[PDB]
Amino acid sequence: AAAVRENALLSSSLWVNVALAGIAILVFVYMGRTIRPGRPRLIWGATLMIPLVSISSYLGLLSGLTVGMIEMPAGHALAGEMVRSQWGRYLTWALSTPMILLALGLLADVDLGSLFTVIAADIGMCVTGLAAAMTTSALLFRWAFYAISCAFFVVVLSALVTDWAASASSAGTAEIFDTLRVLTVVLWLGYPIVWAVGVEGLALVQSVGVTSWAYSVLDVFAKYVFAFILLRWVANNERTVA
Amino acid sequence: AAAVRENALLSSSLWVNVALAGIAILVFVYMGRTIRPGRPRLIWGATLMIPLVSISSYLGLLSGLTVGMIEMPAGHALAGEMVRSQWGRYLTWALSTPMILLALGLLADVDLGSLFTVIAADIGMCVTGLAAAMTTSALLFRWAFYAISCAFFVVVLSALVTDWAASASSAGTAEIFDTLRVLTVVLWLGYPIVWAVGVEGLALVQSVGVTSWAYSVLDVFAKYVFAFILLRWVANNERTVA
Amino acid sequence: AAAVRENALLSSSLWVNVALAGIAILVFVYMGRTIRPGRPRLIWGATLMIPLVSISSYLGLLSGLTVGMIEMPAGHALAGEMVRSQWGRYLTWALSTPMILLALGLLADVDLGSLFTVIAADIGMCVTGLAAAMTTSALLFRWAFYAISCAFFVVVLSALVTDWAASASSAGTAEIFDTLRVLTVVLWLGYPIVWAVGVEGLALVQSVGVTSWAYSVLDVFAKYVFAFILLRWVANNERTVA
Ligand SMILES: *C/C=C(C)/C=C/C=C(C)/C=C/C1=C(C)CCCC1(C)C
Ligand SMILES: *C/C=C(C)/C=C/C=C(C)/C=C/C1=C(C)CCCC1(C)C
Ligand SMILES: *C/C=C(C)/C=C/C=C(C)/C=C/C1=C(C)CCCC1(C)C
Ligand SMILES: CCCCCCCCO[C@@H]1O[C@H](CO)[C@@H](O)[C@H](O)[C@H]1O
Ligand SMILES: CCCCCCCCO[C@@H]1O[C@H](CO)[C@@H](O)[C@H](O)[C@H]1O
Ligand SMILES: CCCCCCCCO[C@@H]1O[C@H](CO)[C@@H](O)[C@H](O)[C@H]1O
Ligand SMILES: [Cl-]
Ligand SMILES: [Cl-]
Ligand SMILES: [Cl-]
């Protein structure tokens, strides 16, 4: 009907990324066999962690381990209903987005003070997003947590468009950093946009299947494709980095 | 009566810090507009994270997300009763007290070996404190976990009064470190004192409202005021740090 | 009978490590009184954290805090039954095995890029192992999570047998690193072997008592004895390290 249909959107959006993460793992391992030790191999190891965390996350959601029903508060578009929350996505973003930040930070050769603060701000972003999805008592707190999460996000992007970009400029990865950083701000902006537009925020799109697929498509560009671009440039520019 | 009264203590002690953390965020952002890039801006970014974690924590407790009832074991002063545990406080101390340690560690220019161990010992302190509050099976374990937590605390203070202080002495922040470190050991000693004296330990003070307010007052000095002192000295001593 | 017997295996395997961890703490503190500041004292502090995390973990399992019943999926050897899962072991490995990696990384003087990736891969190993034990919906996911965990394990061992070993060779701890790294790969291989052979995997050994004792014996060599060897060599080689 539309529950046949809704359950077919959900499972396919999970199984596709279990597949592509696994392939990405296999491709990145293959690519590491051609990379010289040093700062190259160190970026490769951090990058390989991105799809390994990702496949664990989708196995988490698929196995039911990291999914639950959350009752939506009054004034929510779906007030009084139990929607299935893919809260495992927030959990695993917490370990996967620092992996990305570690790769970008190694590439740009950022200072470690900056690295810790960004990864800390990034873990803040992820966790308050989880609080936003888990909050049932009042609609106000759901968006309060959303706004606070955006504040951490703003700290993460600010450090990239300034401090880390400056560091890549004096590390000789200035150009490749520009591309990944353009790619990071555009795709990462998609997630709070999917949150607001979709079932958990405004619920202008009410399918849990659809918003799940939106996240899954974002995961394709922000994890696997992003990672693939990084490694390819690295295997082609091993002097500039080491 | 006294439940009117008890619920008025609890909500005010949460809402006050949601307010002051938010103001502190606004004030620290304002203050960052005058700070030169380098080690100054890096201390500022770490410091700004302190009240952003704090407002998320109080929103967590206020929204009911991170509060539960814990049945107290036999021999507890309130044996057989369900007290409301603000366990969200332990959770968030785990992410906020490393922020403080990061700021103090950047300021003193500590070695990274020391930084990791302290933050690890500090996360140990926080987590076993949570275990102490969550344990229901026996009073012995509650204080066992308490004592172990104090052992991590002792590791954290030892590194500050020696290794990090020595590092600040050869970093030229020797004096400002002295003040913050005096301020840190005094206020941080308050938390295990509030734990023992209040409802969760000995329960010589049995109000959950009151012990919550005690923590909230400690949070005012150990997060916002502490942070405000750091930033002010930094905006006045930007050569010494960079 | 055999539940008298089974509950006697479980409690003794927990209480023995609460005892030996506590003794180990006392012995390592004593040993730190003779260690010179610098890279020596920094390895000592990281090492002391190993048994302090360990005693908290066993107090967690003993107090019932971090133990639950998991219903085993169809096709499991114990399909349809509730076995007691010592999931607290996975939780605490997550904070204790980075402590070990920190000590080995300080000793070998590894690069910080390598340190973060290994500790990240190691936390991945631990967490997906927990997912493996917690998964109830299907036997496939339990071993899927197992295989993914082994992939992180493989990343951790690879970095040790190459990158960190190379770093110890140019740090002068080349020899002591060889011994600890031989000791680490052998003992760490025991844990996924106990997982597969014991109640949670294949259940060729079905006692929860017995598999718990297997883990406890592994904890004796991989935490306390390992740590004791490190400190002894350090107190005897303080020039080579500093
Ligand atoms: C690979 C996964 C990535 C890069 C995920 C990024 C996720 C975010 C940038 C999430 C952002 C959110 C906000 C900024 C507001 C609150 C809701 C969130 C958590 C979706
Ligand atoms: C901003 C929040 C801060 C600085 C919190 C500090 C918390 C502590 C120092 C907690 C200490 C505790 C012990 C030492 C014993 C067990 C109970 C605790 C967790 C309250
Ligand atoms: C002190 C505790 C230590 C060193 C524990 C190490 C644990 C492991 C190496 C666990 C390995 C596992 C796998 C590789 C597969 C999945 C099951 C685990 C988590 C037992
Ligand atoms: C991007 C942030 C804009 C939204 C900020 C908070 C909006 C208040 O909340 C929203 O109000 C609407 C009223 O029916 C509902 O449709 C939504 O489900 C609800 O989340
Ligand atoms: C600062 C640590 C001192 C206390 C150590 C453990 C004390 C044992 O426990 C205490 O015993 C009392 C007996 O009624 C009770 O009032 C307390 O509620 C209980 O926690
Ligand atoms: C080391 C990994 C080898 C096992 C891989 C997955 C094995 C499938 O699973 C196993 O099948 C058996 C059939 O009865 C059962 O005895 C086990 O309990 C079950 O876990
Ligand atoms: Cl993820
Ligand atoms: Cl906090
Ligand atoms: Cl452990």
Descriptive account of the structure:
Chains A, B, C: Belongs to the archaeal/bacterial/fungal opsin family. Chains A, B, C: One of its GO terms (molecular function) is photoreceptor activity. Chains A, B, C: Residues 33-38, 109-111, 162-173 are cytoplasmic. Chains A, B, C: The chain crosses the membrane at residues 7-32, 39-62, 87-108, 112-135, 139-161, 174-197, 208-236. The structure is a homotrimer of 242-residue chains. By secondary structure, the first copy, chain A, is mainly alpha-helical. Chain A has one domain (1-242): Rhodopsin 7-helix transmembrane proteins (Rhopdopsin 7-helix transmembrane proteins, Up-down Bundle). In chain A, 77% of the residues lie in helices and 3% in strands. Chain A has 8 helices and 2 strands. Chain A has helices at residues 3-32, 39-62, 88-108, 112-134, 139-169, 174-197, 208-236, 238-241; strands spanning 68-71, 82-85. A two-stranded antiparallel sheet of chain A has the order 1-2. In chain A, helix 1 (3-32) packs antiparallel against helix 2 (39-62), helix 2 runs antiparallel to helix 3 and helix 5 packs antiparallel against helix 6 (174-197). The interface between A and B is medium-sized, with 28 and 25 residues. The complex binds retinal (RET) (3 copies), octyl beta-D-glucopyranoside (3 copies) and chloride ion (3 copies). One octyl beta-D-glucopyranoside binds at residues 75-77, 139, 143, 196, 201-203 of chain C.
